[PDB]
Design an enzyme around this catalytic site. Structure first.
Site, PDB file in Angstrom:
ATOM      1  N   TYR A 124       0.868  -1.176   0.000  1.00 44.79           N
ATOM      2  CA  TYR A 124       0.000   0.000   0.000  1.00 44.79           C
ATOM      3  C   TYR A 124       0.908   1.230   0.000  1.00 44.79           C
ATOM      4  CZ  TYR A 124      -3.501   3.296   2.081  1.00 44.79           C
ATOM      5  OH  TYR A 124      -4.316   4.380   2.375  1.00 44.79           O
ATOM      6  N   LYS A 134      -0.975  -0.947  -4.406  1.00 47.09           N
ATOM      7  CA  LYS A 134      -2.062   0.020  -4.409  1.00 47.09           C
ATOM      8  C   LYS A 134      -1.309   1.354  -4.560  1.00 47.09           C
ATOM      9  CE  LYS A 134      -5.886   2.247  -1.998  1.00 47.09           C
ATOM     10  NZ  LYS A 134      -5.249   3.584  -1.859  1.00 47.09           N
ATOM     11  N   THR A 190      -1.366   4.811  -4.565  1.00 47.46           N
ATOM     12  CA  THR A 190      -2.118   5.995  -4.141  1.00 47.46           C
ATOM     13  C   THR A 190      -1.160   7.173  -4.329  1.00 47.46           C
ATOM     14  OG1 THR A 190      -2.961   4.581  -2.365  1.00 47.46           O
ATOM     15  CG2 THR A 190      -3.865   6.807  -2.514  1.00 47.46           C
ATOM     16  N   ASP A 248      -8.889   8.655  -7.352  1.00 49.36           N
ATOM     17  CA  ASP A 248     -10.130   8.537  -8.098  1.00 49.36           C
ATOM     18  C   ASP A 248     -10.306   9.607  -9.181  1.00 49.36           C
ATOM     19  OD1 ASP A 248     -10.231   7.012  -5.703  1.00 49.36           O
ATOM     20  OD2 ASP A 248     -12.232   7.634  -5.175  1.00 49.36           O
TER      21      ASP A 248
END
Lengths: 285, 285, 293, 293
Positions: free
Chosen positions: C136, C164, C166, C190
């Site tokens: 992550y 992930k 981000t 997003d």
């Protein structure tokens, strides 16, 4: 060479509305520093002089005027650094010709230079002019490399890293250090810096000298009281706009400090002028 | 005005060992871009041209040579920004006189300008030259303020912030966006940028055009394969030294790309030359 | 193994006013994601779940509730990362026992860990649990930026499946797919779904999919089909919503949007502001009217 | 109240190879600080104690051991800050029950908390415990930089006594003493003790005082007496030691220096590297020979 220790005002320049140099106003700023602020020297062509917004010819005119007005009354350092090394060499030769006591040069900016490139820049200015040099600042190993050139005198220390400050003072004891942060003069002097180069000494010289001297004598509580008043003034200057507020304070002392040079806002607003008046009443009257 | 969409090489300049412009080599770089890379245009006087290490006169000579060599074969943009606004206006007038299709200007650097100062800088260059302008980049509200001047055409987007990229494309749909990061051409084209200005198109134009066109046609997997090979090449160029490696790759294609300009390392080491040879064999042969 | 690609909501958790978990509300959030948002799976115990402000027993309770409610209908990933490696192993064992399909763990933070220490942390969680791992990556909160060579070293462990991402560095994103084509990447921003999908990410894990999952699936699928104009239009509407959500307060606004659809998303957990202001509620209602009605 | 000024060591904790607390070794570290380092007090549960990698029960155990060993001989401050405010209140209540003289708490981290949220966190710990508070500022690890106005707001609570300034911004340090002259400041950067003492800090809290507390007291006291040349000499020797400690690995080197004096400082806790390499041990022995013999 002339003693370069002590208090140096980073010289502000007076500009006309159209951006050109106001020579009479520039001489008044210089006279104010020598005669009333009682500085040990002037640091000409640095950030404070709005240097990087000017042409090569304009930089030369300021060097000429400052040396003509100051003569041999005080020490004079000429900042000649640039992203253009050929320009730095041209300015360094000119200042040397005029009789400046030493050169200084910002690290080349805009692009990312490697250390080898930065050292070659400083060695080139020195080799082509024959003048001694004050560097800006890199770590201990890199200062050591810079200090292998015997004409490098020391550094104008403008980063608030007091651990590196102590390390440099220990590692290279015969090299000089000038503090560049007027608001941290006391802690810098507690570590033994040899002087200070600052924009706020154009109007707050008296207190700057007191802080420096009281600190070297170990009178830390008294030095701190004067640093506190100094920093109340500096805090108001920074909030109101640094270069324009120092010029507006000079105007209240009868010094024709003029306008700032564009792309910086050239004229102070009424509010900025109002705040300058309040600062003068509270801290310089 | 001429169509300014598409692929623009940020023009590299050939220098001699002593730092002066090598005009024959500069014309060979230009001819390589127009005739072999098949760019839509050249972006002259930007970071890639080593512009900020040069004098005003040297910048004018490069503008003259580039326009003389390119004539009307392709679009030409002149980057004329500087910390000195009077210099930017002088360069903008000269480029306009020469017939450049539009001007561009980096945000004033070295000192910290407020937004109002940045907008006044761009409005001043436009008002004094009469030419349209490409800005650099600030947020959506500030672009809106910049876009109140009708002669601002759009922005050379050099920060990898794809959220702001989308926001700008939505908010100001009639303004153009040129991507400044050659290694992120695919994702920029997926958001509809109008073109790209890049230093690696001097040697990797063919793939750059393929990525741009395949992406606009929705052929993302094929575009990504070409972006992968492109980025293997870019990764090797960055590790070996960007400006010197592109010049060394040009030398292997018979283009006298010359030396870099000092304070940048002027001459490539043997190791740098060796790595360039390997890059050419693997990605440009 | 259970497919982990696609659209995953980063599960929000419903808290009571006193900070305890609202189990009924949590279940309603889970149901909303599965039944209405049509997600492929849930990412449980991440930053969005307010995980780092909770005790180990509270984290276990959320894992239990989420697996009991979702059962085997969708894929489930458990984020078990912490600065305490013993806690991370305890949570990873518990999530493994409950049947989570894969584990995930934030890079250890607060202290400035060396790369060998980070790799040892991942290798220890995997060895003690026997479960696969998703790294992550969330540099804005952690301050940890791993490069391509470092991901290579983590991937020497075959149970590390991917990352992930981000982050917004699309040069690094491309370099990852170039170097390790068989490893997975889930986009974490997003508002940048389209450009990440253009570079071949395998899915997306996002907080806004708790309310905007229909549009999020469309952007992803349209971009993969090469329908960029259609995808960009839906990304534009999505980002008008996201821009308003971020300006109004991310956590509280998504919970208020869920509340307007009948989901008891409850309060936020302290030290976060637990309740929205009247002005925040009013703005959330306007966002619902404009974008989710 | 018990005087909190002066020289405080940031207590290191001794761990066993498996990560559990080595109580006997912890007590030896405490004794070394009180009896040999001549500290005014101990700062327990801070970053230096490897606190953030531990469970709540482990933190309670360290608080218990430190208070049982130090008893009332020196001042004791308990750092109870966490991202979980409920944990922070639990720990603050426990440290208060044990008799700690004051609490301290790191600014909540990981998430990007607003100033009102930070102030609410401090106010909640104080209200639930009844104990005074020292704000723990460590921007390099947290990423949180509070300004003068914000310290002003925190100081509206009379039980907030001051700040552990683990930062090098001496303009902000001066502004703090100017604005709030009756509030305390403890310097946190041991290598910058002299310049901080020149600005009137009331004490210092440092990890290197576990082995260099004799020199640390000298620098502090000499600077306060205005004996700058003498103070700078001792700061210079101190910083040669600190430079070597930092290059060799801070935590493991201080523990190895303690081991050479007969203090079982044990291992470091995982995810940190738990054991020093042979090369690290050899370099620590040289630092002991040169500076602590």
């Amino acid at each position: 060479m002339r003693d370069l220790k002590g208090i140096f005002s980073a010289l502000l320049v007076s500009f006309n509305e159209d951006g050109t140099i106001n020579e009479k106003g520039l001489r008044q700023i210089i006279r104010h520093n020598i005669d009333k602020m009682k500085v040990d020297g002037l640091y000409v062509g640095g950030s404070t002089g709005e240097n990087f917004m000017l042409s090569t010819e304009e930089k030369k005119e300021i060097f000429r005027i400052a040396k003509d007005e100051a003569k041999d009354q005080i020490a004079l350092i000429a900042q000649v650094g640039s992203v253009n090394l050929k320009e730095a060499v041209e300015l360094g030769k000119y200042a040397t010709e005029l009789g400046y006591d030493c050169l200084s040069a910002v690290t080349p900016f805009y692009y990312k230079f490697s250390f080898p490139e930065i050292k070659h820049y400083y060695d080139t200015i020195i080799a082509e002019t024959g003048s001694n040099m004050i560097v800006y600042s890199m770590g201990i190993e890199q200062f050591g490399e810079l200090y292998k050139n015997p004409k490098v005198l020391g550094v104008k220390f403008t980063a608030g890293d007091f651990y590196l400050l102590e390390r440099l003072k220990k590692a290279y004891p015969n090299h000089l250090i000038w503090a560049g942060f007027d608001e941290m003069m006391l802690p810098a002097a507690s570590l033994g810096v040899d002087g200070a180069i600052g924009s706020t000494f154009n109007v707050n010289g008296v207190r700057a000298r007191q802080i420096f001297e009281l600190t070297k004598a170990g009178k830390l509580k008294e030095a701190l009281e004067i640093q506190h008043v100094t920093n109340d003034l500096i805090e108001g200057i920074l909030a109101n706009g640094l270069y324009l507020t120092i010029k507006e304070l000079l105007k209240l002392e009868g010094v024709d400090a003029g306008y700032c040079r564009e792309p910086m806002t050239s004229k102070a607003t009424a509010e900025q002028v109002a705040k300058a008046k309040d600062l003068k009443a509270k801290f310089l009257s």
